[PDB]
């Protein structure tokens, strides 16, 4: 309403009836979580895309203003048409549109994954629309990819440009520094995991080849973000296809989680010597530098059943001792926050029943 006379002032008041509408929309089916990273209780929105998202993801959406425009559900004034869009869309709508054609091997980010993975997921879906248009997936769907990737030297720690070739036909990733390749890594033994922090690079990918109970660490990166992520997913395609033929009768659902393993916990501990530690499923590796090519040592963590226990204290402040059948391993953590975690990641192993291959790995150590 207005006021009588010359000035005649328009007053708006405290209504905020439109950002109330959107708020009620957060209770609709499908809108319980971030459209993109799955984080619970989204409290932001892209009104041109009509999705509901978390604070962190909304940051990434601001970089794509030609596709996404964001508002807080609670701290932003909303135009009427904008509420209407959200009302006639939402996260289920966007799944059917933008996640229409997502290869079952393609990696979907979690909130803790690195920024590269989360941003390239959002861009893939909304900017490039890689999953509306199958043509766009050819880089990681042809079963053959080749290109140069900056690779870390084994001991010198430099990063130098080297041709790589992933080929599903031969079933291997190989690189050349050439005639025959400098190395050939059987896809049965590849894992890949993003490690931007460790590698010192936003596009840093750790690729591990396990030949002869030894696990070589290769550390590589691409100047362009999309290309390293295509490489990443090509590798996953390679593993997947390899696994389907290596293990038919196994479902896709049973095979996807194997495609590539992310570490449960890494970080320093004392062994007293300061070493870097990687907990990959069952093998506690340790290193001088985190960018070492080969574990200085390994330690097999079996099960409660096979005479393996993890314990607090020692007989640095907070201790964790890993009692095995042969010997005992004393570890010291800096903080309680860590001790808590490191121990939680070990207990996952103690609990679970061992597999036959894990007996074969134990038989070595």
């Amino acid at each position: 309403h207005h006021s009588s006379g010359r000035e005649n002032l328009y007053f708006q008041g405290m209504a905020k009836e439109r950002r109330r509408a959107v708020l009620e929309l957060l209770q609709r089916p499908g809108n319980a979580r971030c459209a993109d990273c799955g984080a619970p209780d989204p409290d932001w929105a892209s009104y041109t895309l009509g999705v509901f998202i978390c604070l962190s993801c909304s940051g990434i959406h601001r970089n794509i203003p030609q596709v996404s425009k964001v508002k807080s559900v609670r701290l932003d004034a909303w135009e009427e048409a904008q509420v209407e869009f959200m009302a006639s869309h939402g996260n289920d709508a966007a799944r059917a549109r933008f996640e229409s054609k997502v290869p079952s091997f393609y990696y979907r980010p979690t909130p803790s994954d690195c920024q590269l993975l989360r941003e390239q997921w959002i861009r893939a879906k909304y900017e490039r629309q890689e999953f509306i248009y199958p043509e766009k997936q050819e880089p990681y769907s042809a079963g053959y990819r080749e290109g140069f990737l900056w690779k870390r030297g084994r001991d010198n720690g430099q990063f130098l440009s080297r041709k790589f070739v992933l080929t599903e036909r031969e079933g291997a990733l190989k690189y050349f520094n050439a005639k025959e390749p400098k190395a050939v890594m059987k896809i049965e033994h590849l894992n890949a995991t993003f490690q931007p922090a460790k590698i010192g690079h936003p596009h840093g990918l750790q690729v591990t080849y396990l030949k002869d109970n030894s696990t070589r660490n290769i550390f590589i990166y691409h100047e362009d973000g999309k290309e390293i992520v295509d490489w990443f997913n090509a590798l996953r395609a390679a593993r997947f296809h390899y696994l389907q033929v290596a293990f038919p009768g196994a479902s896709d659902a049973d095979l996807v989680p194997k495609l590539s393993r992310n570490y449960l916990k890494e970080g320093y501990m004392e062994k007293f010597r300061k070493r870097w530690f990687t907990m990959d499923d069952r093998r506690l590796m340790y290193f001088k530098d985190p960018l070492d090519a080969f574990a200085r040592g390994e330690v097999f963590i079996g099960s409660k059943e096979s005479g393996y226990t993890v314990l607090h204290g020692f007989p640095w402040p907070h201790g964790i001792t890993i009692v095995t059948p042969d010997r005992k391993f004393l570890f010291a953590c800096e903080t309680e926050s860590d001790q808590r975690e490191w121990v939680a990641a070990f207990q996952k192993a103690v609990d679970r029943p061992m597999l036959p291959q894990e007996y074969a790995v134990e038989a070595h150590f």
Partner: protein, 98 residues
């Protein structure tokens, strides 16, 4: 206090070490005390400062692609021995402190 270029090939005529002044200007402009040319490097791209208190601090210029141990930085940030720095497309450096 010096920076190593992690992309320099020791078997080539590639400059491998850049030394830091107490107030070091980095960028493409002839003025800069470490002159780097490349994709996405401004005439004035960065500033590293050695404090009297003894610490190393990096200050990015605005609208610059800048990462330190793999994460982006748009405010000042203290550097430690061994940290990794990326500027622009592929100006990738390590830091050593005495």
């Amino acid at each position: 206090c010096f920076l190593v270029n992690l992309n320099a090939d020791p078997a080539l005529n590639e400059l491998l070490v850049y030394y830091l002044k107490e107030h070091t200007l980095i960028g493409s402009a002839n003025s800069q005390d470490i002159q780097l040319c490349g994709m996405g490097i401004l005439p004035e791209h960065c500033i590293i400062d050695i404090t009297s208190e003894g610490q190393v601090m990096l200050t990015p210029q605005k609208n610059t692609r800048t990462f330190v141990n793999g994460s982006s930085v748009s405010s000042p940030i203290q550097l430690h021995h061994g940290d990794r720095i990326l500027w622009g497309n592929n100006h990738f450096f390590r830091l050593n402190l005495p």
